[PDB]
Amino acid sequence: STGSATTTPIDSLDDAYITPVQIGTPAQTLNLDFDTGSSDLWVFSSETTASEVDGQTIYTPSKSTTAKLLSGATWSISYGDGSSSSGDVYTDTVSVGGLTVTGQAVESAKKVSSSFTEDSTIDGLLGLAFSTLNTVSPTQQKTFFDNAKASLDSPVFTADLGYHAPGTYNFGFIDTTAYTGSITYTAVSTKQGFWEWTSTGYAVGSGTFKSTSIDGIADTGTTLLYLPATVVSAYWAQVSGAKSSSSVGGYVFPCSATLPSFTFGVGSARIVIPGDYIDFGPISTGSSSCFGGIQSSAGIGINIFGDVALKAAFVVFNGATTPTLGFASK
């Protein structure tokens, strides 16, 4: 089997991407944030504290003839941005782009933190990291991809995120029309539960490539590109007036600037992030200070190849017995 679904930016900045997902019988379609950095499929629901729902579409398990309470199971998750959610668990039928999994754990939110409530466009998350990170207790549950894998034509999914435009998540096949050149595959460590890999270096604009190993994670659920402070300083030094602002929370730059590109290495191959992809717009409405899309990872503990990087590539998440990642230009 295969599936193919369009993913759409939630706003004009590409702050996140939503993909429609069918849950239950009859189908209830929710727009979920596909997150290769986490491993829970959780949704706003009829169980979510009413004051914490503000415009989201909810899953109502009592209206699904295939929903079953997973007795005794609870979940609770905290994300790198400080947001969180928790609740109980159903199993139900879940379809993405024509690919169907029966008995998928659908984690129903009883509580969500303010940033989820405040984002009316995201009805939940669909985790695509390794199932070892799934938070369901006392019986850990499998991701949608893990459950689908054996049925897929090939045990892979691909992320093709757009810049200021829709893109595609495919399951079970590699669309050879969706990228240019060849796909360069690189090793993955699953020891932390992430799609963790080592970039071979970087360049800023037209500058020379610096060969240096940068371990980080391919994370569709993180907006920006988080890299070591040395790398980030080298990038922003090429932008007149750019500075790191403690009060804003990262590098800012004059909105009048033209940003240089940023290149990252995948083996001997190179992925070029155009400068425009690094512009996240005014820090507050009407400001002439703009927020940068490349930020320091120093306070995180891990480097994160988030959407800013991934949207410049066609990315293969290869879930073969030994997982690997593939990157192609497009």
UniProtKB/Swiss-Prot annotation:
One of its GO terms (molecular function) is aspartic-type endopeptidase activity. It comes from Cryphonectria parasitica. This is Endothiapepsin. Residues 17-328 form the Peptidase A1 domain. Belongs to the peptidase A1 family. It comes from the Eukaryota. It is an enzyme of class 3 (hydrolase). Keywords: Aspartyl protease, Disulfide bond, Hydrolase, Protease, Signal, Zymogen. Its EC number is 3.4.23.22. GO terms for biological process: proteolysis. It catalyses: Hydrolysis of proteins with specificity similar to that of pepsin A, prefers hydrophobic residues at P1 and P1', but does not cleave 14-Ala-|-Leu-15 in the B chain of insulin or Z-Glu-Tyr. Clots milk. The keyword S-adenosyl-L-methionine does not apply. The keyword Ion transport does not apply. Disulfide bonds join C255-C290. The active site is at D35, S199.
